[PDB]
Amino acid sequence: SEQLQALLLEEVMNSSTLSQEVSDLVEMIWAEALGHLEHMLGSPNPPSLAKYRALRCKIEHVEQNTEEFLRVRKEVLQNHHSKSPVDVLQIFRVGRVNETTEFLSKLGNVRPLLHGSPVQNIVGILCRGLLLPKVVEDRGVQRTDVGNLGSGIYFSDSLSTSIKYSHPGETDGTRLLLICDVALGKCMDLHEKDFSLTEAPPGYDSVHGVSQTASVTTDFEDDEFVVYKTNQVKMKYIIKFSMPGDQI
Ligand SMILES: NC(=O)C1=CN([C@@H]2O[C@H](COP(=O)(O)OP(=O)(O)OC[C@H]3O[C@@H](n4cnc5c(N)ncnc54)[C@H](O)[C@@H]3O)[C@@H](O)[C@H]2O)C=CC1
């Protein structure tokens, strides 16, 4: 029978929908989340198509010599005011199933921004999107429960800032940050902390903590961009990078 032969070929055609670089990434962030849960509680290579399908998130490797790679690499490094050595390893286009249709692009002032996260959050971030934190209300609100601009989703325009939240993973020591389209809308500039915010001030859609300078002192070392609605955010790229300062 040739119906037998046709189904084995269809298996091959299904498996190849996952590239090698994306399959590697899926296993690493999956290894990192499992390794982290295991550690909380004590205790080439075949395709990991089941793990990738469970992310419900499309991931395409962008090749190191293409126009897209060199441009997006450039944009990531554009505001690296630390001048600390960074090796942009890999770049991935990312697409969540519902993110593209719920995005509030019509607010205007859409900017691409950086969001750093530890590696063990990445599987959850790809499956669910960036989520709002839970607001504290039954006990006193503490500064370990709240960003310095309240209960929102935090971005920066600077790779120097993102490096403070993209910690090296225990698996392979590399760092991940996200590049997101953020619908900033009417963006209010702030020079002082405000832990109590749960939405942008009246008439504004987002908030900007202005980074301190010699002329203008502020409460913010870094530039922070904060939105308070998950649909003001659309993930676009995953960036894998490393820092040699990190070795030895
Ligand atoms: N996160 C950043 O890249 C930046 C953070 N900041 C600074 O950091 C503070 C806020 O730190 P954050 O870690 O951003 O916020 P946070 O203290 O509210 O922590 C929430 C964490 O949950 C993660 N997360 C969000 N949705 C998730 C999901 N669906 N699954 C799994 N994990 C998910 C985020 O990556 C984030 O690290 C601010 O006070 C400011 O000083 C400001 C600029 C950029």
Side-chain angles (χ1 to χ4, degrees):
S1 179
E2 60 174 353
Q3 208 197 50
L4 164 81
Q5 166 201 22
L7 297 180
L8 293 170
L9 302 182
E10 284 150 33
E11 283 317 303
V12 176
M13 290 180 87
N14 182 232
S15 157
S16 304
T17 189
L18 192 55
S19 84
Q20 256 295 314
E21 303 77 351
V22 171
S23 190
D24 292 335
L25 180 73
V26 164
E27 276 292 348
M28 187 263 287
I29 61 175
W30 262 82
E32 190 88 6
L34 158 72
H36 190 276
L37 173 62
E38 263 190 334
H39 177 281
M40 277 197 16
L41 317 173
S43 188
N45 215 78
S48 54
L49 204 75
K51 290 184 185 83
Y52 171 68
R53 282 200 304 263
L55 300 181
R56 287 191 291 101
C57 174
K58 184 169 175 63
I59 294 169
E60 324 179 54
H61 185 234
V62 184
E63 278 282 331
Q64 283 76 10
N65 44 6
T66 65
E67 294 174 343
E68 196 181 2
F69 185 100
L70 299 167
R71 183 224 315 121
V72 171
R73 180 184 149 276
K74 179 156 79 44
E75 292 167 352
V76 169
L77 306 164
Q78 201 187 357
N79 278 338
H80 191 228
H81 316 302
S82 64
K83 318 306 162 356
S84 66
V86 165
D87 294 316
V88 170
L89 306 180
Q90 289 177 307
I91 295 178
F92 298 82
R93 320 174 95 253
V94 157
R96 278 185 70 244
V97 300
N98 294 309
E99 234 173 59
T100 62
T101 194
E102 289 143 8
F103 183 63
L104 301 180
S105 72
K106 291 306 159 288
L107 280 175
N109 192 21
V110 181
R111 294 188 46 172
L113 300 168
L114 305 179
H115 179 81
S117 202
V119 176
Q120 75 267 26
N121 291 338
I122 300 288
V123 295
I125 287 168
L126 300 182
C127 185
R128 294 294 300 279
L130 296 170
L131 304 163
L132 294 170
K134 315 192 189 180
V135 177
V136 197
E137 60 180 352
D138 59 352
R139 50 160 181 79
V141 155
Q142 292 165 44
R143 295 176 64 186
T144 57
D145 289 334
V146 191
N148 51 47
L149 285 164
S151 317
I153 302 162
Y154 287 75
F155 302 87
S156 180
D157 63 2
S158 170
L159 172 63
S160 295
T161 298
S162 298
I163 294 169
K164 307 180 195 178
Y165 313 105
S166 287
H167 305 304
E170 291 193 358
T171 288
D172 68 351
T174 67
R175 305 154 98 105
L176 293 167
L177 65 77
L178 301 173
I179 297 181
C180 301
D181 269 348
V182 185
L184 292 178
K186 285 216 66 163
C187 182
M188 169 166 175
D189 285 353
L190 288 170
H191 296 181
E192 298 163 335
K193 277 167 177 244
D194 192 342
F195 306 104
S196 78
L197 289 170
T198 60
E199 66 192 3
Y204 288 79
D205 310 298
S206 78
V207 175
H208 174 35
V210 181
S211 55
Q212 166 162 298
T213 68
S215 301
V216 182
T217 79
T218 70
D219 290 346
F220 302 102
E221 302 185 353
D222 303 295
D223 283 298
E224 314 185 3
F225 295 86
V226 181
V227 296
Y228 299 91
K229 299 296 183 181
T230 51
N231 49 12
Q232 295 181 251
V233 182
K234 173 214 272 163
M235 307 182 319
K236 260 179 69 192
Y237 293 97
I238 291 175
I239 312 296
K240 180 186 169 95
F241 65 103
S242 64
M243 300 188 68
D246 281 329
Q247 303 290 303
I248 294 169

